[PDB]
């Protein structure tokens, strides 16, 4: 995240950190995700697309730091990895970029509620906030496009949703953005999501609840003028989500 503040998981208790193992000894970070229900985490298919081996991923809940342990964290293996059939990538955009990971702990259970682990609410069918709404995004992604390392502390920032009309302007993204995507930017192009934040949540308040309105998906550069970050519009995937959850 460019800009933002450093935070702790108590502030984003539904954020999930997904790592990949290289038995060479290291486990590296892959993407973020959100806990929908005790056994299901939702992320982005593009995070897995290249190495769809569920057995090598580890999911942690209740984690405030990237490579050091947080007291209260839970570790899970991925029992099912559901990528979106029809996912497609082009020169920028990812289409149908949503994935579901069913988690199981070594004891055979799903997540348990604590002060650092909570689910986030889903929107109702095709129900979104109106452009202008401020939502927050969280993650362990880069702090600057030139960085080649990810921060160790979890960060968060607030961004505003913009209309499709604004985002589909030719000098923004044109038609690369569809109705199944949402764009969000900082009025001052000062804060934004970046490489490493893919899969994490775009949370807004909808009908009184903190709702998972988008999934961090793509964007040209990070915190660039007229280049908002694009998110998968969760409200348009509700049937898909239910067919599997």
């Amino acid at each position: 995240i460019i800009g933002g503040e450093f935070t702790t998981i108590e502030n984003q208790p539904w954020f999930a950190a997904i790592y990949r193992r290289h038995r060479g000894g290291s486990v590296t970070y892959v993407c973020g995700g959100s806990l929908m229900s005790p056994c299901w985490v939702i992320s982005a298919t593009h995070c897995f697309i290249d190495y769809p081996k569920k057995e090598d991923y580890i999911v942690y809940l209740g984690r405030s730091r990237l490579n050091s342990n947080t007291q209260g964290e839970m570790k899970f293996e991925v029992e099912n990895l559901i990528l979106h059939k029809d996912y497609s990538a082009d020169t920028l955009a990812h289409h149908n970029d949503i994935a579901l990971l069913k988690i199981r702990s070594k004891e055979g259970r799903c997540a348990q509620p604590s002060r650092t682990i909570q689910t986030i609410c889903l929107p109702s069918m095709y129900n979104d906030p109106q452009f202008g709404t401020s939502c927050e995004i969280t993650g362990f992604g880069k702090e600057a496009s030139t960085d080649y390392l990810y921060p160790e502390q979890l960060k968060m920032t607030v961004v505003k949703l913009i209309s499709h009309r604004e985002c589909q302007q030719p000098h923004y993204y044109g038609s690369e953005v569809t109705t199944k995507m949402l764009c969000a930017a900082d009025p001052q192009w000062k804060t934004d999501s970046c490489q490493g934040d893919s899969g994490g949540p775009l949370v807004c308040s909808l009908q009184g609840r903190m709702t998972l309105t988008g999934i961090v998906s793509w964007g040209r550069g990070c915190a660039l003028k007229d280049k908002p970050g694009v998110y998968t519009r969760v409200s348009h995937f509700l049937p898909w989500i239910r067919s599997h959850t």
Binding site: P113, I120, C121
Partner: peptide
């Protein structure tokens, strides 16, 4: 005890 989606506190 049980989850309450969206609730931090």
């Amino acid at each position: 005890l049980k989850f309450q989606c969206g609730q931090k506190t």
